[PDB]
Ligand binder design. Structure first.
Ligand SMILES: NC(=O)c1ccc[n+]([C@@H]2O[C@H](COP(=O)([O-])OP(=O)(O)OC[C@H]3O[C@@H](n4cnc5c(N)ncnc54)[C@H](O)[C@@H]3O)[C@@H](O)[C@H]2O)c1
Ligand SMILES: NC(=O)c1ccc[n+]([C@@H]2O[C@H](COP(=O)([O-])OP(=O)(O)OC[C@H]3O[C@@H](n4cnc5c(N)ncnc54)[C@H](O)[C@@H]3O)[C@@H](O)[C@H]2O)c1
Lengths: 320, 320
């Protein structure tokens, strides 16, 4: 049974991943950390093994690793696509420097290390229909740039020092628990909240812009699964994974089918649209499926039913 | 007429580029900077317009730019392939951080900025014959990883802010002006010296490993030409350029054909071997030819004749 460190743990992915790890391996085997402390209403508030650590503080990062002696690490902090275009110096600092520290710690302390990539590592030359694992990578966002740097550096660590670096290119992730941190796919979660609150939703992505997406329970399954795989079954360090693709107009229809209630949606093209337009419409994830058994249970309507149930319970929005 | 700033200017490229720029534009038009001073025998020793600057010092780099007001910048400092693998923290510091500051300055002060990339930005999935401008980039060295980041970040600056960022992927560059160090293609400059000295050459590169390469006067021509082009002529930010390809054993036959003597080469194992083996055999530079008139005069024998004439004149080794 592994000892697992999650850094950047209080955000969208980290909140549910931390709970799932704890459930599967037991709380004593999981330590999580974030630059901020949890609010009283955060799901990880009041739990043991939840620490304050700025990953840019490389001494504090080493101390924590040396004390806990993880065998696995999920290194999650990054400034994402939309927010990075508005805060590019913070993105370059966090996404490049915390990654370099994390990899050197994986090398020095023998850790299997996962650092997520993203569909934002692609740009407009990738071949946007059923995008392959190996293709031209020309990101149009600083976030995307720093994620291609992530993939390549991690792979270099694997080749040069035998560091067990693993990654997936995550699609937009949908969940109910913790609000998203500023990607171009944040509209999808907000659309649900707009429908439940009966407020107008202003969508900055255009109505027919299809993107690869996935619901959180499939994501968690894959994040765990890729880490448990024997190193011999892996043919590459970085895998595309997807759940299913959708556009905003498709998601809106899914939500109105479940609520029996028109959502009001004004498309008013923001930063997210130009960014999303440079990304894949869909991904080919045959390598992940073949090598380590990436699998998806949820479709768009299963997800929307679950989302529409969870959000009122978790956030006290109105129900139905 | 431009006001040109060259950073990392005392090296192999910088030394001869700085001379060519001062000839073409006038010494008062050109400012050369480096983190070291020129040695007593350096071609730039004693001249005006030679400043000392550590480009890792963001504030001092901004001061120099404020004071001189360049319209063009050639940003040249980097840790290259063999030294990068031995000192990767230095490479990641220099190659990423100085590049970020350079681009920021080009943004803030309206500078046309050239930062070279390299054939080391490619790895074994590039398509090693006549490698294309847009292909899979999977570099096998930390240097190479940092240069993909350089290309992508530079390009983002161009897209996001309209910075007039220009780059070529330089092949192995051969010149007489500087003494052969321990770099990966530095074997070729070593062989010339051994031929003149009638010593044996110790070559870590496999005998038949073809690499793209170029002789300096062609390099100088293209480095100036790409910066003179109107922006409207450029269809891209990063171009392949090559001179011609050769292997160590081709270089030896060339040197033999010129000197009418047998020269001695011992092929050994060394870090350069595996690095070189991961790089392209030849490059397609048709974009660079068509857009801005990249042109190559020299072939191997013309270079060998010249090198065998120049090294004795500049370094005072035995001639003929
Ligand atoms: N959510 C998505 O749809 C999506 C898609 C693709 C890739 N990803 C990647 O997954 C990762 C996690 O994303 P997420 O959505 O949970 O993001 P998030 O923004 O919701 O969470 C980021 C967490 O990192 C923490 N953090 C920020 N800077 C830190 C620092 N210096 N030190 C320590 N912690 C720091 C933040 O406080 C936050 O709790 C990132 O690498 C992101 O690129 C997410
Ligand atoms: N020479 C080649 O065959 C070749 C091939 C491909 C690409 N390039 C690229 O050309 C550029 C220069 O290559 P070169 O061969 O002249 O290198 P070089 O190593 O001969 O010279 C580099 C110079 O940079 C200086 N420098 C190092 N750190 C610095 C700092 N912090 N601040 C300011 N200056 C610093 C060094 O003192 C040295 O004078 C690099 O970007 C290299 O990647 C070179």
């Amino acid at each position: 049974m592994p000892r697992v460190l999650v850094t950047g743990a209080l955000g969208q992915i980290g909140t549910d991943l931390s709970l799932a790890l704890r459930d599967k391996f037991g709380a004593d085997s999981v330590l999580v950390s974030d630059v901020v402390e949890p609010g009283a209403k955060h799901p990880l508030a009041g739990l043991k093994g939840v620490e304050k650590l700025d990953c840019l503080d490389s001494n504090g990062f080493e101390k924590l690793v040396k004390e806990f002696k993880p065998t696995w690490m999920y290194h999650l902090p990054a400034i994402m696509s939309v927010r990075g275009e508005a805060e590019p110096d913070l993105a370059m600092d966090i996404n490049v420097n915390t990654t370099r520290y994390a990899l050197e710690l994986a090398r020095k302390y023998n850790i299997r290390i996962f650092i997520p990539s993203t569909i934002a590592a692609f740009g407009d030359k990738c071949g946007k229909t059923m995008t392959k694992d190996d293709t031209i990578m020309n990101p149009s966002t600083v976030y995307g740039v720093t994620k291609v740097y992530t993939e390549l550096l991690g792979t270099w660590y694997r080749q040069k020092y035998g560091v067990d670096f693993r990654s997936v290119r995550l699609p937009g992730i949908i969940s109910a628990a913790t609000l998203p941190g500023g990607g171009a796919t944040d509209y999808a979660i907000h659309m649900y909240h707009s429908a439940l609150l009966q407020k107008k939703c202003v969508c900055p992505v255009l109505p027919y812009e299809s993107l690869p997406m996935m619901y959180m329970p499939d994501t968690l399954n894959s994040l765990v699964k890729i880490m448990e795989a024997p190193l011999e079954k892996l043919t590459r360090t970085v895998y595309n994974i997807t759940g299913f693709s959708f556009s905003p107009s498709e998601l809106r229809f899914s939500i109105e089918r479940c609520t029996d209630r028109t959502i009001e949606v004004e498309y008013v093209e923001g930063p997210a649209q130009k960014i999303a337009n440079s990304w894949p419409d869909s991904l080919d994830d045959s390598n992940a499926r073949n090598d380590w058994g990436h699998q998806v249970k949820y479709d768009i309507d299963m997800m929307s039913e679950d989302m529409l149930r969870q959000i009122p319970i978790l956030h006290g929005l109105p129900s139905l």
